[PDB]
Structures are given as structure tokens and as C-alpha cells.
């Protein structure tokens, strides 16, 4: 469980950036998004949690917690968090265009995540997290989109985020099988057996700061890391969308907001 390689030095170099991405199936970029814009999104999520998660109205972002992710009306949270305005801000688009080397289309769907620490819990609720999977298994038909994952407040090794299997995107779609320990809508979801992820596809996770981006290939095998933070005990607050060349086919998920899919 190593660390992401910082790819920010490669942004000035089309060839070098693409070569890294091709080999590894991800890019980790530090301090490339407008931190004021990110903070505004974080504070929108915070206000949603005050209104819907019974979060402390006087807590700072890092003091924030909620009793239960599940007790929060996720549909209502989408009214609070103004992600489309963020993704489509010129400063954000510029970074996306640097990554792709061409004009882009940002998905109309974004997933917002507000996961409290469950350090010390004997029966923790982590069924709302994700098993090993590839976004391309459930998004298509085109497979040239990339997932863009951003922290809204900082993450730590203990507070979690997403773990990536380095270079796991080079053998196409992998088998996803029912996993009863991960659920959406009472339905179990499908994941890649952890045994079917090679020891050679080294698992990576680094702490990230608001302003940072993690992005990865449609066939990158990745999974949630649970929040077991204690000192500091932090929420993990993040959001993820998908982005693709403006010219590429725009599928169902690309055109359909989260609340309707
Ligand atoms: C495979 C699992 C984990 C990734 C996706 C996910 C997520 O939260 O990213 C929840 C499941 C529902 C889904 C149909 C969108 C597919 C999911
Ligand atoms: O953030 C998480 O726990 C899981 N995220 C993803 O699977 C993603 O962004 O594609
Ligand atoms: Fe995913
Ligand atoms: Mg107080
Ligand atoms: Mg392939």
C-alpha cells in the first residue's frame, strides 16, 4: 500500500504526461485547482450536513462529523453541493484540457461523499463504500472517459480515499462478481475479487490536500479505503465525476444527473 507518484512536474510535457498515464493508468496532480473554489464546495457540503445530517452548526470543516452517512438524504445533498459550477469553472476546465490535450465534456453526474470516521466501532457501516472495481464496468459504451476524484477537505492515510492498483488498466475489463458486503439501495454491488488483482499491480494511496486531483483510466482497478481516523478524527469529504474528450460519444451516465440514475 504505497503512495501515488506526484505527476505535477509532468504537466509541461504532453509526451511525458501521456507516457506516465499510459503506463500507470492514473495521474496525481498537486495544487492545480483553485483552493478558494474547492473551499466553497466544501462549505456547501458542510451546510448540507448541518441542514440534513444534524452536524454541529458551529464546527469547523475539520471538526465536522455526522452520526451516520445513511441518515443523510443523499438526494437533498445534491441541492446543496454546486459541483457543476465547480467542474465547469474556466480554471478547472483549463486543467482538464491540459490532461486530455483537447477540449473536454464533463459528465452531468457527480458522486458526493461525506464519510464519518468509524474508528472504534464494533459493527462499522462500510457497506456504502466501493469494492475493487473499474468505472468502465458500469459506465459506457465508450471507454475513453477518465474519473476525476477530488478531496474537499484533506485526507490522511487513516481517513481514507481511493486506493489504486498501479497499472491495472492494461488488460481490459475484468470480471465483477456479486459482493454482499457492499450495497446500493439494499442491492449488493459487483466487485473484482481482491484475489484477481495482481500482487504486481501495487496498491497506492496518498494523503491529498484540497486543490489536488487524482484521475484514472476507465479500466483502472480501484477501491474505497475506509475512514478509521482517530487523531485527527476527520470526515472524508470528496467528490468524483468523469470527464471525456468533447468529441467522444456521450453515454447514459454522461448525460444523466446522479439523482436520476
Ligand atoms: C461497482 C460499485 C462501486 C462503484 C459504483 C458506486 C460508487 O459509489 O462509486 C456505487 C455502485 C453503484 C454503481 C452502479 C454506480 C456501481 C458502483
Ligand atoms: O471515493 C470512493 O470511496 C470510491 N470512488 C470511486 O470509486 C470513484 O471515484 O470512481
Ligand atoms: Fe469508481
Ligand atoms: Mg459548540
Ligand atoms: Mg485495453
Amino acid at each position: 500500500t504505497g503512495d501515488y507518484t506526484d505527476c505535477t512536474p509532468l504537466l509541461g510535457d504532453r509526451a511525458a504526461l501521456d507516457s506516465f498515464y499510459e503506463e500507470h493508468g492514473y495521474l496525481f496532480l498537486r495544487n492545480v485547482l483553485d483552493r478558494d473554489l474547492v473551499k466553497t464546495v466544501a462549505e456547501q457540503m458542510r451546510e448540507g450536513l448541518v441542514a440534513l445530517g444534524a452536524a454541529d452548526p458551529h464546527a469547523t470543516l475539520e471538526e465536522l462529523t455526522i452520526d451516520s452517512f445513511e441518515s443523510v438524504d443523499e438526494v437533498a445533498m445534491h441541492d446543496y453541493v454546486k459541483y457543476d459550477a465547480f467542474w465547469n469553472n474556466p480554471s478547472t476546465i483549463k486543467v482538464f484540457e491540459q490532461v486530455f490535450g483537447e477540449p473536454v465534456f464533463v459528465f452531468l453526474s457527480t458522486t458526493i461523499r461525506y464519510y464519518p470516521s468509524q474508528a472504534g466501532s464494533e459493527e462499522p457501516s462500510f457497506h456504502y463504500l466501493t469494492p475493487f472495481h473499474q468505472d468502465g464496468f458500469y459506465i459506457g459504451p465508450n471507454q475513453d472517459f477518465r474519473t476525476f476524484w477530488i478531496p474537499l477537505i484533506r485526507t490522511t492515510r487513516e481517513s481514507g480515499g481511493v486506493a489504486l492498483a498501479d497499472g491495472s488498466h492494461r488488460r481490459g475489463k475484468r470480471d465483477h462478481v456479486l459482493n454482499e458486503s457492499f450495497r446500493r439501495f439494499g442491492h449488493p454491488v459487483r466487485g473484482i475479487p481482491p484475489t484477481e488483482v495482481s500482487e504486481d499491480e501495487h496498491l497506492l494511496h496518498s494523503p491529498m490536500e484540497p486543490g489536488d486531483i487524482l484521475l484514472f483510466h476507465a479500466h483502472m482497478c480501484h477501491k474505497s479505503i475506509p475512514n478509521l481516523s482517530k487523531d485527527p478524527r476527520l470526515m472524508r469529504m470528496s467528490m468524483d465525476t468523469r470527464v471525456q474528450p468533447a468529441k467522444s460519444h456521450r453515454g447514459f451516465n454522461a448525460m444523466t444527473p446522479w439523482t436520476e440514475s
Side-chain angles (χ1 to χ4, degrees), residues 14-228:
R14 171 62 46 214
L17 191 75
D18 292 342
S19 180
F20 186 100
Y21 176 73
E22 279 156 18
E23 190 79 2
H24 293 279
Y26 77 90
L27 297 165
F28 172 41
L29 304 171
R30 282 189 163 127
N31 201 357
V32 291
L33 298 173
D34 182 330
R35 284 166 157 171
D36 299 315
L37 295 180
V38 176
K39 180 151 282 186
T40 61
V41 183
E43 295 174 334
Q44 290 167 356
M45 181 176 279
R46 187 187 64 69
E47 198 58 16
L49 294 172
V50 167
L52 306 159
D56 176 5
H58 308 295
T60 64
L61 283 167
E62 283 187 352
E63 287 169 351
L64 201 71
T65 191
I66 57 170
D67 293 334
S68 162
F69 168 86
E70 314 102 286
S71 71
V72 181
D73 181 343
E74 195 171 356
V75 170
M77 283 294 293
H78 280 259
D79 292 337
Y80 282 88
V81 188
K82 305 301 182 178
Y83 42 77
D84 292 324
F86 176 82
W87 298 132
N88 296 100
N89 189 291
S91 70
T92 306
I93 293 298
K94 293 313 152 306
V95 177
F96 291 173
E97 289 197 24
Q98 287 177 312
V99 170
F100 285 88
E102 60 182 310
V104 303
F105 175 82
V106 186
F107 275 37
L108 304 189
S109 46
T110 293
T111 293
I112 56 172
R113 299 179 201 264
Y114 35 94
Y115 298 155
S117 172
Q118 294 183 72
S121 289
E122 298 191 350
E123 292 173 289
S125 298
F126 290 130
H127 57 268
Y128 51 80
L129 300 182
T130 72
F132 268 123
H133 68 283
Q134 295 167 122
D135 277 19
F137 178 81
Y138 75 94
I139 299 173
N142 60 302
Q143 301 284 287
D144 65 339
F145 65 88
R146 305 185 199 184
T147 302
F148 278 72
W149 190 99
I150 77 162
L152 301 176
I153 69 165
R154 74 193 181 92
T155 58
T156 61
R157 292 279 289 200
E158 293 80 15
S159 79
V162 288
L164 305 184
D166 193 352
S168 63
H169 65 302
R170 284 152 65 192
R171 65 184 201 99
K173 299 184 168 180
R174 297 188 200 198
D175 294 342
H176 288 58
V177 302
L178 189 139
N179 188 323
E180 296 284 344
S181 74
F182 294 101
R183 305 180 287 283
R184 295 306 184 281
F185 327 117
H187 289 274
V189 299
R190 305 180 71 94
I192 302 166
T195 184
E196 190 188 56
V197 174
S198 172
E199 213 176 37
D200 298 328
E201 293 157 346
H202 306 289
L203 199 62
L204 311 178
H205 170 59
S206 294
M208 299 175 71
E209 281 283 321
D212 295 356
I213 295 176
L214 184 64
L215 69 100
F216 49 89
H217 187 106
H219 298 165
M220 167 57 66
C221 300
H222 63 287
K223 67 181 189 179
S224 301
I225 296 165
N227 189 346
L228 297 164

